[PDB]
Amino acid sequence: ADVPAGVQLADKQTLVRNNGSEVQSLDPHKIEGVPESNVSRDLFEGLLISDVEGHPSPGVAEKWENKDFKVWTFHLRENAKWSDGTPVTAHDFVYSWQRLADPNTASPYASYLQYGHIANIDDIIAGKKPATDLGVKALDDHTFEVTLSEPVPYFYKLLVHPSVSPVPKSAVEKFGDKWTQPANIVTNGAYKLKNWVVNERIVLERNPQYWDNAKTVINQVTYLPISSEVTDVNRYRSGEIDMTYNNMPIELFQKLKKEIPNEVRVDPYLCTYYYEINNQKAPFNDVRVRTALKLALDRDIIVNKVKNQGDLPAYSYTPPYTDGAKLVEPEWFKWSQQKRNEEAKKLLAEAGFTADKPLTFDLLYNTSDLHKKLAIAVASIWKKNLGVNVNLENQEWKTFLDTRHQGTFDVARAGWCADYNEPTSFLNTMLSDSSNNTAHYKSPAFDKLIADTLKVADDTQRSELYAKAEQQLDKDSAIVPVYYYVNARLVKPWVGGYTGKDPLDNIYVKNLYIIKH
Ligand SMILES: N[C@@H](CCCC[NH3+])C(=O)N[C@@H](CCCC[NH3+])C(=O)O
Ligand code: IUM
Ligand code: IUM
Ligand code: IUM
Ligand code: IUM
Numbered sequence: 041a042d043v044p045a046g047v048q049l050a051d052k053q054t055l056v057r058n059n060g061s062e063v064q065s066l067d068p069h070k071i072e073g074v075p076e077s078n079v080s081r082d083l084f085e086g087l088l089i090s091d092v093e094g095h096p097s098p099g100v101a102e103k104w105e106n107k108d109f110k111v112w113t114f115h116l117r118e119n120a121k122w123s124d125g126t127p128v129t130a131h132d133f134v135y136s137w138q139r140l141a142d143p144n145t146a147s148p149y150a151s152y153l154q155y156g157h158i159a160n161i162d163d164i165i166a167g168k169k170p171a172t173d174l175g176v177k178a179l180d181d182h183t184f185e186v187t188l189s190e191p192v193p194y195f196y197k198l199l200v201h202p203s204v205s206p207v208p209k210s211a212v213e214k215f216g217d218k219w220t221q222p223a224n225i226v227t228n229g230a231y232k233l234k235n236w237v238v239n240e241r242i243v244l245e246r247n248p249q250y251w252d253n254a255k256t257v258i259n260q261v262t263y264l265p266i267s268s269e270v271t272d273v274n275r276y277r278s279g280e281i282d283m284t285y286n287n288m289p290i291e292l293f294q295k296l297k298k299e300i301p302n303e304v305r306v307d308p309y310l311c312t313y314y315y316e317i318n319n320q321k322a323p324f325n326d327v328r329v330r331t332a333l334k335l336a337l338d339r340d341i342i343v344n345k346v347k348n349q350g351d352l353p354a355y356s357y358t359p360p361y362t363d364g365a366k367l368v369e370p371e372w373f374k375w376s377q378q379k380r381n382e383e384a385k386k387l388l389a390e391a392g393f394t395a396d397k398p399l400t401f402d403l404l405y406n407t408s409d410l411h412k413k414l415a416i417a418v419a420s421i422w423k424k425n426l427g428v429n430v431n432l433e434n435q436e437w438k439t440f441l442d443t444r445h446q447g448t449f450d451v452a453r454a455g456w457c458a459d460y461n462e463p464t465s466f467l468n469t470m471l472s473d474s475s476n477n478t479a480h481y482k483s484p485a486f487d488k489l490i491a492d493t494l495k496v497a498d499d500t501q502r503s504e505l506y507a508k509a510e511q512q513l514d515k516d517s518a519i520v521p522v523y524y525y526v527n528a529r530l531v532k533p534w535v536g537g538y539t540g541k542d543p544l545d546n547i548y549v550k551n552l553y554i555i556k557h
Protein backbone atom coordinates (compact mmCIF):
# COMPACT_ATOMS: atom_id res chain seq x y z
CA ALA A 41 0.00 0.00 0.00
CA ASP A 42 1.11 3.55 -0.82
CA VAL A 43 -0.38 5.79 1.87
CA PRO A 44 -0.62 9.42 0.75
CA ALA A 45 1.31 12.04 2.70
CA GLY A 46 -0.84 13.65 5.40
CA VAL A 47 -3.28 10.74 5.75
CA GLN A 48 -3.81 9.60 9.34
CA LEU A 49 -4.07 5.82 9.78
CA ALA A 50 -6.41 4.12 12.22
CA ASP A 51 -4.78 2.30 15.14
CA LYS A 52 -6.54 -0.95 14.19
CA GLN A 53 -5.85 -2.00 10.59
CA THR A 54 -8.50 -4.65 9.93
CA LEU A 55 -10.88 -5.13 7.00
CA VAL A 56 -14.10 -7.10 6.40
CA ARG A 57 -15.18 -7.91 2.81
CA ASN A 58 -18.26 -9.83 1.60
CA ASN A 59 -17.35 -12.50 -0.99
CA GLY A 60 -20.73 -13.57 -2.43
CA SER A 61 -20.65 -17.28 -1.53
CA GLU A 62 -18.56 -20.08 0.00
CA VAL A 63 -15.47 -20.72 -2.16
CA GLN A 64 -15.03 -23.89 -4.19
CA SER A 65 -11.53 -24.30 -2.77
CA LEU A 66 -8.35 -22.49 -1.70
CA ASP A 67 -6.19 -24.64 -4.04
CA PRO A 68 -5.19 -22.55 -7.09
CA HIS A 69 -5.59 -25.55 -9.45
CA LYS A 70 -9.15 -26.40 -8.32
CA ILE A 71 -10.85 -22.99 -8.75
CA GLU A 72 -12.69 -21.16 -11.54
CA GLY A 73 -14.69 -18.22 -10.16
CA VAL A 74 -14.60 -14.63 -8.92
CA PRO A 75 -15.08 -15.42 -5.21
CA GLU A 76 -12.26 -17.98 -5.37
CA SER A 77 -9.89 -15.56 -7.15
CA ASN A 78 -10.60 -12.78 -4.62
CA VAL A 79 -9.10 -14.85 -1.77
CA SER A 80 -6.40 -16.43 -3.98
CA ARG A 81 -4.79 -13.05 -4.84
CA ASP A 82 -4.08 -12.42 -1.11
CA LEU A 83 -2.56 -15.87 -0.49
CA PHE A 84 -0.65 -16.97 -3.62
CA GLU A 85 1.55 -14.82 -5.87
CA GLY A 86 2.57 -15.80 -9.41
CA LEU A 87 5.23 -14.41 -11.76
CA LEU A 88 3.44 -11.09 -12.31
CA ILE A 89 0.65 -9.31 -10.37
CA SER A 90 -1.74 -6.47 -11.32
CA ASP A 91 -0.87 -3.05 -9.87
CA VAL A 92 -3.61 -0.84 -8.34
CA GLU A 93 -4.81 0.27 -11.81
CA GLY A 94 -4.74 -3.20 -13.40
CA HIS A 95 -1.42 -3.09 -15.26
CA PRO A 96 0.60 -6.32 -15.43
CA SER A 97 3.57 -5.78 -13.06
CA PRO A 98 6.36 -7.58 -11.20
CA GLY A 99 5.30 -10.39 -8.84
CA VAL A 100 7.79 -13.12 -7.87
CA ALA A 101 9.56 -12.26 -11.14
CA GLU A 102 11.34 -8.90 -10.91
CA LYS A 103 12.26 -8.77 -14.61
CA TRP A 104 11.66 -10.77 -17.80
CA GLU A 105 12.57 -10.96 -21.50
CA ASN A 106 11.26 -12.75 -24.61
CA LYS A 107 12.79 -14.16 -27.80
CA ASP A 108 10.43 -13.89 -30.80
CA PHE A 109 7.40 -14.05 -28.46
CA LYS A 110 8.10 -17.81 -28.12
CA VAL A 111 10.72 -18.22 -25.35
CA TRP A 112 10.01 -16.24 -22.17
CA THR A 113 12.63 -15.91 -19.41
CA PHE A 114 11.68 -14.76 -15.90
CA HIS A 115 14.19 -13.55 -13.30
CA LEU A 116 12.84 -14.27 -9.80
CA ARG A 117 13.72 -11.96 -6.89
CA GLU A 118 16.19 -13.44 -4.39
CA ASN A 119 14.11 -12.63 -1.29
CA ALA A 120 10.82 -14.22 -2.41
CA LYS A 121 9.73 -16.50 0.45
CA TRP A 122 6.89 -18.80 1.56
CA SER A 123 5.14 -18.30 4.94
CA ASP A 124 7.37 -20.94 6.58
CA GLY A 125 10.51 -18.94 5.67
CA THR A 126 11.67 -21.13 2.77
CA PRO A 127 12.61 -19.49 -0.53
CA VAL A 128 10.27 -19.38 -3.52
CA THR A 129 12.24 -20.86 -6.46
CA ALA A 130 11.87 -21.57 -10.20
CA HIS A 131 11.46 -25.25 -9.21
CA ASP A 132 8.20 -24.30 -7.45
CA PHE A 133 6.85 -22.91 -10.75
CA VAL A 134 7.96 -25.98 -12.75
CA TYR A 135 6.17 -28.31 -10.33
CA SER A 136 3.06 -26.08 -10.19
CA TRP A 137 2.49 -25.66 -13.95
CA GLN A 138 3.06 -29.42 -14.40
CA ARG A 139 0.37 -30.13 -11.76
CA LEU A 140 -2.02 -27.76 -13.58
CA ALA A 141 -1.42 -29.61 -16.88
CA ASP A 142 -1.78 -33.14 -15.49
CA PRO A 143 -5.18 -34.67 -16.27
CA ASN A 144 -5.21 -36.40 -12.85
CA THR A 145 -5.54 -32.93 -11.26
CA ALA A 146 -8.68 -32.32 -13.36
CA SER A 147 -8.35 -28.55 -13.12
CA PRO A 148 -11.18 -26.45 -14.53
CA TYR A 149 -8.38 -24.19 -15.84
CA ALA A 150 -6.17 -26.91 -17.39
CA SER A 151 -6.84 -25.21 -20.76
CA TYR A 152 -5.16 -21.96 -19.55
CA LEU A 153 -1.89 -23.62 -20.66
CA GLN A 154 -3.49 -24.17 -24.10
CA TYR A 155 -4.51 -20.49 -24.25
CA GLY A 156 -0.86 -19.47 -23.72
CA HIS A 157 0.30 -22.30 -26.02
CA ILE A 158 2.98 -23.82 -23.76
CA ALA A 159 4.84 -26.58 -25.61
CA ASN A 160 3.37 -30.10 -25.47
CA ILE A 161 0.15 -29.11 -23.63
CA ASP A 162 -2.31 -30.85 -26.00
CA ASP A 163 -0.53 -34.22 -25.69
CA ILE A 164 -0.29 -33.88 -21.89
CA ILE A 165 -4.01 -33.08 -21.55
CA ALA A 166 -4.86 -36.04 -23.80
CA GLY A 167 -2.70 -38.47 -21.77
CA LYS A 168 -0.23 -39.16 -24.60
CA LYS A 169 2.71 -37.57 -22.75
CA PRO A 170 3.57 -37.23 -19.05
CA ALA A 171 3.22 -33.81 -17.41
CA THR A 172 7.03 -33.61 -17.06
CA ASP A 173 7.21 -33.05 -20.86
CA LEU A 174 5.61 -29.58 -20.45
CA GLY A 175 7.60 -26.73 -22.03
CA VAL A 176 8.84 -25.17 -18.75
CA LYS A 177 12.23 -25.42 -17.00
CA ALA A 178 14.20 -23.96 -14.10
CA LEU A 179 17.59 -22.77 -15.41
CA ASP A 180 18.67 -22.21 -11.79
CA ASP A 181 16.90 -21.52 -8.46
CA HIS A 182 15.93 -18.01 -9.61
CA THR A 183 15.36 -18.35 -13.36
CA PHE A 184 12.16 -19.80 -14.90
CA GLU A 185 12.04 -20.39 -18.68
CA VAL A 186 8.82 -21.01 -20.65
CA THR A 187 8.73 -22.26 -24.27
CA LEU A 188 5.67 -21.79 -26.51
CA SER A 189 4.68 -23.61 -29.72
CA GLU A 190 3.98 -20.32 -31.55
CA PRO A 191 4.48 -16.58 -31.06
CA VAL A 192 2.12 -15.02 -28.50
CA PRO A 193 2.83 -11.27 -28.04
CA TYR A 194 0.37 -10.90 -25.14
CA PHE A 195 1.61 -13.99 -23.21
CA TYR A 196 2.79 -12.10 -20.08
CA LYS A 197 -0.70 -10.60 -19.61
CA LEU A 198 -2.01 -14.10 -18.77
CA LEU A 199 0.35 -14.56 -15.81
CA VAL A 200 -1.60 -12.67 -13.13
CA HIS A 201 -4.30 -15.41 -13.00
CA PRO A 202 -4.51 -17.75 -9.99
CA SER A 203 -4.19 -20.96 -12.06
CA VAL A 204 -0.52 -20.09 -12.76
CA SER A 205 0.38 -19.24 -9.12
CA PRO A 206 2.77 -21.59 -7.27
CA VAL A 207 1.67 -24.30 -4.81
CA PRO A 208 3.91 -25.85 -2.12
CA LYS A 209 4.92 -29.36 -3.22
CA SER A 210 5.80 -30.64 0.26
CA ALA A 211 2.37 -29.76 1.73
CA VAL A 212 0.48 -31.06 -1.32
CA GLU A 213 2.30 -34.38 -1.22
CA LYS A 214 2.12 -34.90 2.55
CA PHE A 215 -1.51 -33.84 3.13
CA GLY A 216 -3.22 -34.38 -0.25
CA ASP A 217 -6.64 -32.68 -0.31
CA LYS A 218 -6.18 -31.38 3.26
CA TRP A 219 -3.15 -29.25 2.34
CA THR A 220 -5.23 -26.04 2.42
CA GLN A 221 -6.35 -26.42 6.06
CA PRO A 222 -4.94 -23.74 8.37
CA ALA A 223 -2.62 -26.14 10.22
CA ASN A 224 -1.09 -27.46 6.96
CA ILE A 225 -1.15 -24.63 4.39
CA VAL A 226 1.90 -22.65 3.24
CA THR A 227 1.45 -19.44 1.17
CA ASN A 228 3.63 -16.82 -0.61
CA GLY A 229 1.35 -13.81 -1.00
CA ALA A 230 1.00 -10.88 1.43
CA TYR A 231 -1.32 -12.88 3.75
CA LYS A 232 -1.48 -16.28 5.47
CA LEU A 233 -4.54 -18.35 6.37
CA LYS A 234 -5.56 -17.90 9.98
CA ASN A 235 -9.07 -19.38 10.19
CA TRP A 236 -11.55 -21.06 7.85
CA VAL A 237 -15.09 -21.92 8.96
CA VAL A 238 -17.20 -23.21 6.06
CA ASN A 239 -20.30 -21.05 5.59
CA GLU A 240 -19.19 -18.52 8.23
CA ARG A 241 -15.87 -16.84 7.47
CA ILE A 242 -12.32 -16.97 6.10
CA VAL A 243 -9.78 -14.96 8.14
CA LEU A 244 -6.32 -14.05 6.78
CA GLU A 245 -3.41 -12.46 8.67
CA ARG A 246 -0.29 -10.64 7.48
CA ASN A 247 2.55 -12.88 6.25
CA PRO A 248 5.80 -11.48 7.71
CA GLN A 249 7.90 -13.48 5.21
CA TYR A 250 6.33 -11.81 2.15
CA TRP A 251 9.07 -9.95 0.23
CA ASP A 252 7.09 -6.67 0.14
CA ASN A 253 5.75 -6.98 3.71
CA ALA A 254 7.19 -3.60 4.79
CA LYS A 255 4.61 -1.91 2.51
CA THR A 256 1.63 -4.06 3.68
CA VAL A 257 -0.67 -2.05 5.99
CA ILE A 258 -3.80 -4.13 6.73
CA ASN A 259 -2.96 -6.73 9.39
CA GLN A 260 -6.09 -8.86 9.04
CA VAL A 261 -8.85 -9.31 6.45
CA THR A 262 -12.05 -11.38 6.77
CA TYR A 263 -13.95 -12.75 3.74
CA LEU A 264 -17.69 -13.64 4.25
CA PRO A 265 -19.97 -15.98 2.19
CA ILE A 266 -23.22 -13.98 2.11
CA SER A 267 -25.28 -14.72 -1.01
CA SER A 268 -28.15 -12.30 -0.26
CA GLU A 269 -27.29 -8.89 -1.74
CA VAL A 270 -29.80 -7.27 0.64
CA THR A 271 -28.14 -8.86 3.70
CA ASP A 272 -24.69 -7.76 2.50
CA VAL A 273 -25.91 -4.15 2.20
CA ASN A 274 -27.62 -4.36 5.62
CA ARG A 275 -24.42 -5.61 7.34
CA TYR A 276 -22.35 -2.96 5.54
CA ARG A 277 -24.63 -0.15 6.76
CA SER A 278 -24.78 -1.55 10.32
CA GLY A 279 -20.98 -1.27 10.47
CA GLU A 280 -19.88 -4.92 10.23
CA ILE A 281 -18.78 -4.92 6.57
CA ASP A 282 -16.29 -2.47 5.04
CA MET A 283 -16.66 -3.55 1.38
CA THR A 284 -19.70 -5.34 -0.10
CA TYR A 285 -19.48 -7.98 -2.85
CA ASN A 286 -20.03 -6.49 -6.32
CA ASN A 287 -23.62 -7.63 -6.85
CA MET A 288 -26.18 -4.93 -5.83
CA PRO A 289 -29.76 -5.63 -4.73
CA ILE A 290 -32.60 -4.47 -7.02
CA GLU A 291 -34.68 -3.67 -3.92
CA LEU A 292 -32.27 -1.02 -2.60
CA PHE A 293 -29.88 0.26 -5.31
CA GLN A 294 -31.87 3.32 -6.42
CA LYS A 295 -32.23 4.52 -2.81
CA LEU A 296 -28.58 3.84 -2.00
CA LYS A 297 -27.45 6.14 -4.82
CA LYS A 298 -29.55 8.94 -3.30
CA GLU A 299 -28.51 8.31 0.34
CA ILE A 300 -24.78 7.54 0.14
CA PRO A 301 -23.60 8.55 -3.34
CA ASN A 302 -19.93 8.77 -2.36
CA GLU A 303 -19.94 5.13 -1.16
CA VAL A 304 -21.68 3.74 -4.27
CA ARG A 305 -18.83 2.86 -6.65
CA VAL A 306 -19.75 2.15 -10.31
CA ASP A 307 -16.95 1.54 -12.86
CA PRO A 308 -16.29 -0.21 -16.19
CA TYR A 309 -15.95 -4.03 -15.95
CA LEU A 310 -14.97 -6.61 -18.61
CA CYS A 311 -17.71 -9.19 -17.99
CA THR A 312 -20.81 -10.41 -19.86
CA TYR A 313 -24.06 -11.67 -18.31
CA TYR A 314 -25.79 -14.35 -20.41
CA TYR A 315 -28.03 -17.41 -20.40
CA GLU A 316 -25.92 -20.49 -21.12
CA ILE A 317 -27.69 -23.11 -23.27
CA ASN A 318 -26.66 -26.77 -23.01
CA ASN A 319 -25.90 -27.24 -26.72
CA GLN A 320 -25.61 -31.06 -26.56
CA LYS A 321 -29.08 -31.80 -25.15
CA ALA A 322 -32.30 -32.03 -27.16
CA PRO A 323 -34.15 -29.97 -27.86
CA PHE A 324 -31.41 -27.36 -27.42
CA ASN A 325 -29.28 -29.02 -30.13
CA ASP A 326 -31.67 -27.51 -32.70
CA VAL A 327 -30.51 -24.04 -33.81
CA ARG A 328 -34.13 -22.90 -34.39
CA VAL A 329 -34.83 -23.42 -30.67
CA ARG A 330 -31.67 -21.60 -29.52
CA THR A 331 -32.33 -18.69 -31.92
CA ALA A 332 -35.94 -18.30 -30.72
CA LEU A 333 -34.84 -17.98 -27.07
CA LYS A 334 -32.07 -15.52 -28.00
CA LEU A 335 -34.38 -13.23 -29.98
CA ALA A 336 -37.46 -13.36 -27.72
CA LEU A 337 -35.60 -12.06 -24.65
CA ASP A 338 -36.14 -8.29 -24.36
CA ARG A 339 -32.82 -6.73 -23.29
CA ASP A 340 -34.25 -3.19 -22.93
CA ILE A 341 -36.75 -4.37 -20.31
CA ILE A 342 -34.14 -6.37 -18.38
CA VAL A 343 -31.41 -3.72 -18.45
CA ASN A 344 -33.34 -0.46 -18.13
CA LYS A 345 -36.57 -1.47 -16.44
CA VAL A 346 -35.66 -4.38 -14.14
CA LYS A 347 -32.05 -3.81 -13.04
CA ASN A 348 -31.37 -0.15 -13.91
CA GLN A 349 -27.78 -0.06 -12.63
CA GLY A 350 -25.94 1.15 -15.76
CA ASP A 351 -25.37 -2.15 -17.61
CA LEU A 352 -25.45 -2.18 -21.43
CA PRO A 353 -27.63 -4.43 -23.64
CA ALA A 354 -25.55 -7.24 -25.18
CA TYR A 355 -25.33 -8.75 -28.65
CA SER A 356 -22.07 -10.72 -28.28
CA TYR A 357 -20.00 -12.81 -25.81
CA THR A 358 -16.77 -10.77 -25.79
CA PRO A 359 -17.52 -7.24 -24.47
CA PRO A 360 -17.04 -4.68 -27.28
CA TYR A 361 -14.71 -2.52 -25.15
CA THR A 362 -12.18 -5.34 -24.60
CA ASP A 363 -8.68 -4.30 -25.81
CA GLY A 364 -8.56 -5.63 -29.38
CA ALA A 365 -12.32 -5.95 -29.97
CA LYS A 366 -13.81 -4.44 -33.15
CA LEU A 367 -17.14 -6.23 -33.34
CA VAL A 368 -19.99 -6.07 -35.86
CA GLU A 369 -23.53 -5.66 -34.39
CA PRO A 370 -25.82 -8.38 -35.79
CA GLU A 371 -28.82 -7.11 -37.76
CA TRP A 372 -31.30 -8.82 -35.37
CA PHE A 373 -30.15 -6.40 -32.62
CA LYS A 374 -31.31 -3.46 -34.75
CA TRP A 375 -34.88 -4.74 -35.30
CA SER A 376 -37.84 -3.87 -33.10
CA GLN A 377 -38.65 -6.33 -30.29
CA GLN A 378 -41.93 -7.08 -32.10
CA LYS A 379 -40.03 -8.23 -35.22
CA ARG A 380 -37.72 -10.33 -33.04
CA ASN A 381 -40.78 -11.89 -31.39
CA GLU A 382 -42.40 -12.85 -34.71
CA GLU A 383 -39.18 -14.44 -35.99
CA ALA A 384 -38.86 -16.38 -32.72
CA LYS A 385 -42.45 -17.69 -32.74
CA LYS A 386 -42.12 -18.72 -36.41
CA LEU A 387 -38.92 -20.68 -35.63
CA LEU A 388 -40.54 -22.56 -32.74
CA ALA A 389 -43.56 -23.27 -34.96
CA GLU A 390 -41.19 -24.70 -37.60
CA ALA A 391 -39.51 -26.82 -34.89
CA GLY A 392 -42.81 -28.53 -33.97
CA PHE A 393 -44.02 -26.63 -30.90
CA THR A 394 -47.69 -25.69 -30.49
CA ALA A 395 -50.11 -24.32 -27.87
CA ASP A 396 -51.04 -27.88 -26.85
CA LYS A 397 -47.40 -29.04 -26.87
CA PRO A 398 -45.22 -26.13 -25.80
CA LEU A 399 -41.53 -25.89 -25.03
CA THR A 400 -40.93 -26.41 -21.30
CA PHE A 401 -37.55 -26.49 -19.55
CA ASP A 402 -35.42 -25.56 -16.52
CA LEU A 403 -33.59 -22.30 -15.72
CA LEU A 404 -30.78 -22.89 -13.21
CA TYR A 405 -29.07 -20.11 -11.24
CA ASN A 406 -26.74 -19.79 -8.23
CA THR A 407 -28.52 -18.76 -5.01
CA SER A 408 -28.90 -14.98 -5.05
CA ASP A 409 -31.60 -12.29 -4.77
CA LEU A 410 -30.28 -10.55 -7.90
CA HIS A 411 -30.06 -13.70 -10.06
CA LYS A 412 -33.51 -14.83 -8.86
CA LYS A 413 -35.16 -11.50 -9.76
CA LEU A 414 -33.48 -11.52 -13.19
CA ALA A 415 -34.57 -15.13 -13.86
CA ILE A 416 -38.18 -14.36 -12.84
CA ALA A 417 -38.27 -11.44 -15.31
CA VAL A 418 -36.78 -13.60 -18.09
CA ALA A 419 -39.33 -16.36 -17.43
CA SER A 420 -42.19 -13.85 -17.69
CA ILE A 421 -40.80 -12.25 -20.86
CA TRP A 422 -40.31 -15.62 -22.57
CA LYS A 423 -43.85 -16.68 -21.58
CA LYS A 424 -45.49 -13.51 -22.94
CA ASN A 425 -43.38 -13.04 -26.08
CA LEU A 426 -42.91 -16.66 -27.06
CA GLY A 427 -45.26 -18.96 -25.10
CA VAL A 428 -42.51 -21.02 -23.42
CA ASN A 429 -42.71 -22.28 -19.83
CA VAL A 430 -39.69 -22.43 -17.51
CA ASN A 431 -39.06 -23.93 -14.08
CA LEU A 432 -36.59 -21.92 -11.97
CA GLU A 433 -34.06 -23.82 -9.84
CA ASN A 434 -31.43 -22.43 -7.40
CA GLN A 435 -28.19 -24.20 -6.36
CA GLU A 436 -25.27 -23.24 -4.08
CA TRP A 437 -22.26 -21.73 -5.90
CA LYS A 438 -19.93 -24.78 -5.75
CA THR A 439 -22.73 -27.20 -6.70
CA PHE A 440 -23.90 -24.89 -9.53
CA LEU A 441 -20.49 -24.88 -11.24
CA ASP A 442 -20.30 -28.70 -10.97
CA THR A 443 -23.77 -29.08 -12.57
CA ARG A 444 -22.75 -26.88 -15.52
CA HIS A 445 -19.56 -28.91 -16.12
CA GLN A 446 -21.50 -32.19 -15.95
CA GLY A 447 -24.15 -31.07 -18.45
CA THR A 448 -26.76 -31.67 -15.73
CA PHE A 449 -29.00 -28.94 -17.16
CA ASP A 450 -31.14 -27.22 -19.79
CA VAL A 451 -30.46 -23.46 -19.52
CA ALA A 452 -28.39 -21.68 -16.84
CA ARG A 453 -27.65 -18.17 -15.62
CA ALA A 454 -24.02 -17.32 -16.43
CA GLY A 455 -21.27 -14.72 -16.36
CA TRP A 456 -17.71 -14.64 -17.72
CA CYS A 457 -15.17 -11.99 -16.62
CA ALA A 458 -11.86 -11.53 -18.46
CA ASP A 459 -8.71 -13.10 -16.98
CA TYR A 460 -6.54 -10.93 -19.25
CA ASN A 461 -7.60 -7.98 -21.41
CA GLU A 462 -7.64 -9.49 -24.92
CA PRO A 463 -10.52 -11.08 -26.88
CA THR A 464 -9.17 -14.65 -26.61
CA SER A 465 -9.71 -14.52 -22.80
CA PHE A 466 -13.37 -14.86 -23.79
CA LEU A 467 -13.22 -16.66 -27.17
CA ASN A 468 -10.93 -19.51 -26.02
CA THR A 469 -13.65 -20.66 -23.60
CA MET A 470 -15.93 -21.68 -26.52
CA LEU A 471 -13.28 -23.88 -28.19
CA SER A 472 -14.50 -27.49 -28.60
CA ASP A 473 -11.99 -28.91 -26.12
CA SER A 474 -11.75 -26.06 -23.58
CA SER A 475 -11.91 -27.04 -19.89
CA ASN A 476 -13.91 -23.82 -19.35
CA ASN A 477 -16.54 -24.72 -21.97
CA THR A 478 -19.77 -25.19 -19.98
CA ALA A 479 -21.95 -24.37 -23.02
CA HIS A 480 -20.92 -27.78 -24.41
CA TYR A 481 -20.59 -26.09 -27.81
CA LYS A 482 -18.47 -27.74 -30.49
CA SER A 483 -17.92 -25.99 -33.82
CA PRO A 484 -15.10 -26.89 -36.20
CA ALA A 485 -15.64 -23.57 -38.00
CA PHE A 486 -15.35 -21.58 -34.74
CA ASP A 487 -12.22 -23.52 -33.70
CA LYS A 488 -10.49 -22.83 -37.04
CA LEU A 489 -11.12 -19.07 -36.88
CA ILE A 490 -9.41 -18.86 -33.47
CA ALA A 491 -6.50 -21.11 -34.47
CA ASP A 492 -5.80 -18.71 -37.37
CA THR A 493 -5.37 -15.67 -35.07
CA LEU A 494 -1.86 -16.71 -33.97
CA LYS A 495 -0.88 -17.86 -37.46
CA VAL A 496 -0.81 -14.23 -38.55
CA ALA A 497 1.63 -11.67 -37.10
CA ASP A 498 -0.83 -8.82 -37.50
CA ASP A 499 -3.47 -7.10 -35.38
CA THR A 500 -5.90 -6.00 -38.10
CA GLN A 501 -6.23 -9.58 -39.34
CA ARG A 502 -6.41 -10.76 -35.72
CA SER A 503 -9.24 -8.34 -34.85
CA GLU A 504 -11.13 -9.21 -38.04
CA LEU A 505 -10.92 -12.94 -37.19
CA TYR A 506 -12.18 -12.31 -33.64
CA ALA A 507 -15.16 -10.43 -35.14
CA LYS A 508 -15.82 -13.35 -37.52
CA ALA A 509 -15.60 -15.80 -34.60
CA GLU A 510 -18.28 -13.81 -32.74
CA GLN A 511 -20.40 -13.88 -35.93
CA GLN A 512 -20.08 -17.69 -36.05
CA LEU A 513 -21.15 -18.01 -32.40
CA ASP A 514 -24.14 -15.73 -33.05
CA LYS A 515 -25.10 -17.61 -36.24
CA ASP A 516 -25.28 -20.84 -34.23
CA SER A 517 -26.98 -19.14 -31.25
CA ALA A 518 -24.58 -20.84 -28.84
CA ILE A 519 -25.65 -18.50 -26.03
CA VAL A 520 -28.21 -15.86 -25.14
CA PRO A 521 -26.33 -12.58 -24.50
CA VAL A 522 -28.05 -10.29 -21.98
CA TYR A 523 -25.84 -7.41 -20.82
CA TYR A 524 -22.26 -6.15 -20.46
CA TYR A 525 -21.60 -5.49 -16.75
CA VAL A 526 -20.76 -2.41 -14.77
CA ASN A 527 -18.86 -3.05 -11.49
CA ALA A 528 -21.16 -1.76 -8.72
CA ARG A 529 -20.33 -2.13 -5.01
CA LEU A 530 -20.31 -0.18 -1.72
CA VAL A 531 -16.97 0.90 -0.10
CA LYS A 532 -16.72 2.76 3.26
CA PRO A 533 -15.18 6.25 3.21
CA TRP A 534 -12.30 5.08 5.43
CA VAL A 535 -11.11 2.36 3.02
CA GLY A 536 -8.24 3.84 1.00
CA GLY A 537 -6.46 2.42 -2.05
CA TYR A 538 -9.34 1.30 -4.31
CA THR A 539 -9.22 3.26 -7.58
CA GLY A 540 -12.03 1.69 -9.65
CA LYS A 541 -9.73 1.96 -12.69
CA ASP A 542 -8.97 -1.75 -13.15
CA PRO A 543 -11.48 -3.18 -15.63
CA LEU A 544 -10.63 -6.70 -14.40
CA ASP A 545 -11.10 -5.75 -10.72
CA ASN A 546 -8.05 -7.64 -9.49
CA ILE A 547 -7.88 -6.24 -5.95
CA TYR A 548 -5.05 -7.09 -3.54
CA VAL A 549 -5.65 -6.32 0.18
CA LYS A 550 -1.91 -5.49 0.53
CA ASN A 551 -2.70 -2.28 -1.42
CA LEU A 552 -5.46 -1.00 0.91
CA TYR A 553 -5.36 0.94 4.20
CA ILE A 554 -7.78 2.13 6.92
CA ILE A 555 -8.04 5.90 7.46
CA LYS A 556 -8.50 7.03 11.09
CA HIS A 557 -12.18 7.51 11.92
N1 LIG B 1 -12.81 -15.84 -15.67
C1 LIG B 1 -13.36 -16.41 -14.40
C2 LIG B 1 -12.83 -15.72 -13.15
C3 LIG B 1 -12.71 -14.22 -13.20
C4 LIG B 1 -11.89 -13.74 -11.99
C5 LIG B 1 -10.42 -13.89 -12.34
N2 LIG B 1 -10.03 -12.93 -13.41
C6 LIG B 1 -14.89 -16.40 -14.42
O1 LIG B 1 -15.54 -15.54 -15.03
N3 LIG B 1 -15.47 -17.44 -13.83
C7 LIG B 1 -16.91 -17.61 -13.81
C8 LIG B 1 -17.29 -19.09 -13.66
C9 LIG B 1 -16.81 -19.94 -14.83
C10 LIG B 1 -17.89 -20.82 -15.41
C11 LIG B 1 -17.35 -21.73 -16.50
N4 LIG B 1 -17.83 -21.33 -17.86
C12 LIG B 1 -17.62 -16.84 -12.70
O2 LIG B 1 -16.96 -16.46 -11.72
O3 LIG B 1 -18.85 -16.62 -12.85
O1 IUM C 1 -10.50 4.15 19.39
U1 IUM C 1 -11.81 3.31 18.30
O2 IUM C 1 -13.01 2.32 17.22
O1 IUM D 1 3.25 -7.33 -30.96
U1 IUM D 1 2.25 -6.34 -31.99
O2 IUM D 1 1.30 -5.49 -33.14
O1 IUM E 1 3.55 -6.09 -28.15
U1 IUM E 1 2.50 -4.51 -28.21
O2 IUM E 1 1.45 -2.83 -28.15
O1 IUM F 1 -3.16 -1.16 -23.85
U1 IUM F 1 -3.09 -2.44 -25.29
O2 IUM F 1 -2.98 -3.72 -26.62
Ligand code: IUM
Pocket residue numbers: 400401402449450
Ligand atom coordinates in the same frame (compact mmCIF):
# COMPACT_ATOMS: atom_id res chain seq x y z
O1 IUM G 1 -36.42 -29.74 -18.05
U1 IUM G 1 -35.38 -30.47 -17.70
O2 IUM G 1 -34.30 -31.19 -17.37
Ligand code: IUM
Pocket residue numbers: 270291409
Ligand atom coordinates in the same frame (compact mmCIF):
# COMPACT_ATOMS: atom_id res chain seq x y z
O1 IUM H 1 -35.05 -9.31 -0.30
U1 IUM H 1 -35.65 -9.99 -1.59
O2 IUM H 1 -36.42 -10.54 -2.79
Ligand code: IUM
Pocket residue numbers: 557
Ligand atom coordinates in the same frame (compact mmCIF):
# COMPACT_ATOMS: atom_id res chain seq x y z
O1 IUM I 1 -14.39 4.91 15.68
U1 IUM I 1 -13.73 6.27 16.09
O2 IUM I 1 -13.06 7.58 16.33
